[PDB]
Structure formats: structure tokens, C-alpha cells
Tab-separated table of C-alpha atoms and ligand atoms in Angstrom:
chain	number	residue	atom	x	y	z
L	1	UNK	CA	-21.117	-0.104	-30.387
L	2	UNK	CA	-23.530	-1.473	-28.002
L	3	UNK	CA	-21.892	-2.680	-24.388
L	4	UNK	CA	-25.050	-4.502	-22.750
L	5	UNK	CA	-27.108	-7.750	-23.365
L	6	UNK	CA	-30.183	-7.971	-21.038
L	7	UNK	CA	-30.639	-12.361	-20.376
L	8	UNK	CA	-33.774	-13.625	-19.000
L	9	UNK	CA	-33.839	-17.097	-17.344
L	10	UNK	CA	-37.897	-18.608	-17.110
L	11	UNK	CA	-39.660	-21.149	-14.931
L	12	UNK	CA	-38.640	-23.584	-17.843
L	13	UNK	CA	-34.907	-23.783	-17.223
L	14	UNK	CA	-34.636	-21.239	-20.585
L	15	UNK	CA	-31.905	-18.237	-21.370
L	16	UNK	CA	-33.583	-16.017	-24.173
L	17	UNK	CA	-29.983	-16.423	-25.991
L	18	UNK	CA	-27.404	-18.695	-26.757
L	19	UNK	CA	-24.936	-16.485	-28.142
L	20	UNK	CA	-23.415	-12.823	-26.727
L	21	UNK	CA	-20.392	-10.917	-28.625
L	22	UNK	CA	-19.070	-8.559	-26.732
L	23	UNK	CA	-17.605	-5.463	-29.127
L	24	UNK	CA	-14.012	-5.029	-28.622
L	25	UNK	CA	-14.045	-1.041	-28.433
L	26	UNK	CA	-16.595	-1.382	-25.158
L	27	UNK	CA	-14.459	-1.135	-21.973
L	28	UNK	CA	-16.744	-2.309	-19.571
L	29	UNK	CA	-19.749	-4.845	-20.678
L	30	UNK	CA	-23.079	-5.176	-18.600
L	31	UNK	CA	-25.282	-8.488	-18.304
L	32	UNK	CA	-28.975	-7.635	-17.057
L	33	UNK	CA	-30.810	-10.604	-15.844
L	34	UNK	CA	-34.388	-10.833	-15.048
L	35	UNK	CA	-36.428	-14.077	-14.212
L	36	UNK	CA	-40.065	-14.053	-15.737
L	37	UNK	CA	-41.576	-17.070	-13.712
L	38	UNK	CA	-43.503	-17.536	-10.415
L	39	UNK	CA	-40.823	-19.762	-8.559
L	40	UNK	CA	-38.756	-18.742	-6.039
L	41	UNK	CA	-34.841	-19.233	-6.241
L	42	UNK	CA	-34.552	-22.041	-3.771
L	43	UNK	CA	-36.703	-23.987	-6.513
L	44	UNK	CA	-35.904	-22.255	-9.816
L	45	UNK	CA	-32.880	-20.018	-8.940
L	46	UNK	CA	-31.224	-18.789	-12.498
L	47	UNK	CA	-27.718	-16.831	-12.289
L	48	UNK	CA	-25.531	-15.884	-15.273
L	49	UNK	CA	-21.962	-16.684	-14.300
L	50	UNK	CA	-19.152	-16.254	-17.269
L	51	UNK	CA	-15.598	-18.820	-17.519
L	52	UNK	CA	-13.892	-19.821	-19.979
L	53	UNK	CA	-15.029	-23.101	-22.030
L	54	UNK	CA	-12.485	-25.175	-20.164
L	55	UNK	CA	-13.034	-24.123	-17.046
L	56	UNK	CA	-16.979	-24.077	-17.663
L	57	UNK	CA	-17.505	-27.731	-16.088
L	58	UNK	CA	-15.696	-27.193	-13.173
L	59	UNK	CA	-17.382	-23.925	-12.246
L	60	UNK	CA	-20.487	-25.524	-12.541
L	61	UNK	CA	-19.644	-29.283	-10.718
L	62	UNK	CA	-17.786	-26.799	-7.597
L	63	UNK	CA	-21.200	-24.280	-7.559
L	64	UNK	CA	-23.926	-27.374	-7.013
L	65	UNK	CA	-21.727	-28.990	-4.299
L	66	UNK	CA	-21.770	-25.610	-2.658
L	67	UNK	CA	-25.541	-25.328	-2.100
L	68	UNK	CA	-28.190	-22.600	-2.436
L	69	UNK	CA	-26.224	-20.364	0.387
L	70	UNK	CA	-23.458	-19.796	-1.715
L	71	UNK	CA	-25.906	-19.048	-4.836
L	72	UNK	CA	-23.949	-22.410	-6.001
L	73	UNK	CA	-20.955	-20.747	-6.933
L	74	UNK	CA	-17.673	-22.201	-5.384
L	75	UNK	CA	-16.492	-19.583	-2.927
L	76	UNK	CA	-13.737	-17.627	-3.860
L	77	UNK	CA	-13.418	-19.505	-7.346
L	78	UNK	CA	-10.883	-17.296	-9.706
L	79	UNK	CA	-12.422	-19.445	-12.424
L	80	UNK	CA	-15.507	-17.082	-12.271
L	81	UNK	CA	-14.292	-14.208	-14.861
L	82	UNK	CA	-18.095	-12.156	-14.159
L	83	UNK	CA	-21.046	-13.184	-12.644
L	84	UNK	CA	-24.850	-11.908	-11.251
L	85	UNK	CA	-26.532	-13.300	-8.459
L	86	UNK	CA	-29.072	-16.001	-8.051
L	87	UNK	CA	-31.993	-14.819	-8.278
L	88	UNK	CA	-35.923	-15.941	-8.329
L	89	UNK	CA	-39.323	-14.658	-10.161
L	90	UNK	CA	-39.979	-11.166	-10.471
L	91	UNK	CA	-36.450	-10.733	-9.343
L	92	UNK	CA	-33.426	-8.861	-11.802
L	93	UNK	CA	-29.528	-8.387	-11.053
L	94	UNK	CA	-27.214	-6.869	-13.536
L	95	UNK	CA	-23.449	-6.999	-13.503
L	96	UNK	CA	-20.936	-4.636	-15.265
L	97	UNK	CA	-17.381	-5.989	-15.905
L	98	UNK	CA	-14.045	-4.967	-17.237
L	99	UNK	CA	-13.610	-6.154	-20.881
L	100	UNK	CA	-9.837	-6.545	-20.492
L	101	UNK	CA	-10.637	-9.639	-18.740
L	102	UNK	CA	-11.481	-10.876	-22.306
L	103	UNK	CA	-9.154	-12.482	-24.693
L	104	UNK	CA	-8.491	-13.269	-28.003
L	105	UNK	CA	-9.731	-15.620	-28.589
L	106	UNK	CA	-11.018	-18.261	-26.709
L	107	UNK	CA	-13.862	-19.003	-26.280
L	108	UNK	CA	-16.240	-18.062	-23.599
L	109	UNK	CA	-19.339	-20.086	-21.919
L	110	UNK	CA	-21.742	-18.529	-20.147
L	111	UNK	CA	-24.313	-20.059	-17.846
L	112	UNK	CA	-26.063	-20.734	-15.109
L	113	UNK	CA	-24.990	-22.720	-11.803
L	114	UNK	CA	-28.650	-23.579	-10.384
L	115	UNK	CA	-27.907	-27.911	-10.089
L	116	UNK	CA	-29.061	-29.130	-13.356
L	117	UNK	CA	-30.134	-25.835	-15.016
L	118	UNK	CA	-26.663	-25.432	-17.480
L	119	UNK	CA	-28.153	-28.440	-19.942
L	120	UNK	CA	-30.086	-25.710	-21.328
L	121	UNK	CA	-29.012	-22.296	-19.692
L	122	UNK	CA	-25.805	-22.082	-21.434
L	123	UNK	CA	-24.349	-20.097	-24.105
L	124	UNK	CA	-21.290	-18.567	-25.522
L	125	UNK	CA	-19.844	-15.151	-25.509
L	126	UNK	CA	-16.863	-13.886	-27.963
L	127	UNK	CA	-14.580	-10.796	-28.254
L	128	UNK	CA	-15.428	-9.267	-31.625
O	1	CU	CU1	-19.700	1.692	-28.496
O	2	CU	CU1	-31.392	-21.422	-13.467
């Protein structure tokens, strides 16, 4: 089956898609993320970072307290199941992880940790 989605995160606080499955025969699962857009990522900085539902708020309330030098991501936060990097315009990161992190079933969010930018950069991936 397909194991790769590619996201793109815009100048208007956008993800292309609201919804991933990821196919339970893939064994590893890759996120490519490009930013169409002018604005640099001190200003309009879009990651993709994947947690749980639960633990979705959290993630996101620890990554704006830690600033733009930790790409707003708490450091070592074991929350974090995948994640890219922050990136700005013209910029892409992909990033390939093991689907045996995944579970049935539950009830994934994924989103972005730029302050302010998960109101509409958020989605949700399933096992399926
Ligand atoms: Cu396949
Ligand atoms: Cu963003």
C-alpha cells in the first residue's frame, strides 16, 4: 500500500490535509513537508510534529514556551511519537518513522507547534 503523505503548510497558517491513515502492512511511514509561502520561519515557521490526541495539548503549550531555538518543541519531550523540523518558504523536511510506534487504536493528532498555528494546522492520523 502506499507508506508516504507529502503535507504542505502556506503563508496562511494552512496544512493541505486534515486527515492521514497510515496502512498497517507499511513498516516505516514518511511525512514530506514543504512550505509554499514567502515568509521566513521566525515569522511563519510550519513543522509537522505527531502525539497522541491526549497528549496533543501539552506538546503544543511545552513547544511555544520553548521559543523559535528549539523549533518550539519541548526538548527531550517523549510525548513527540515523530516529528520534521521547522521550517520556512521555499524550505522542505521529510521524516521517516517506525510504524510500530502506532497503536490500535487511538487516535492520533498531528500538527504543527509554530505559537498559534495548531487552530488550523492540525489533523488526525489512524492505523488502518
Ligand atoms: Cu505497501
Ligand atoms: Cu506553522
Amino acid at each position: 500500500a502506499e507508506c508516504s503523505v507529502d503535507i504542505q503548510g502556506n503563508d496562511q497558517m494552512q496544512f493541505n490535509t486534515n486527515a492521514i491513515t497510515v496502512d498497517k502492512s507499511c513498516k516505516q511511514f514518511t511525512v514530506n513537508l514543504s512550505h509554499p509561502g514567502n515568509l521566513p520561519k521566525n515569522v511563519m515557521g510550519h513543522n509537522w510534529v505527531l502525539s497522541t490526541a491526549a497528549d496533543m495539548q501539552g506538546v503544543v503549550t511545552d513547544g511555544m514556551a520553548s521559543g523559535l531555538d528549539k523549533d518550539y518543541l519541548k526538548p527531550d519531550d517523549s510525548r513527540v511519537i515523530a516529528h520534521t523540523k521547522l521550517i520556512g518558504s521555499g524550505e522542505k523536511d521529510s521524516v521517516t518513522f517506525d510504524v510500530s510506534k502506532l497503536k490500535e487504536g487511538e487516535q492520533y493528532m498531528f500538527f504543527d507547534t509554530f505559537p498559534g498555528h495548531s487552530a488550523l494546522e492540525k489533523g488526525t492520523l489512524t492505523l488502518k
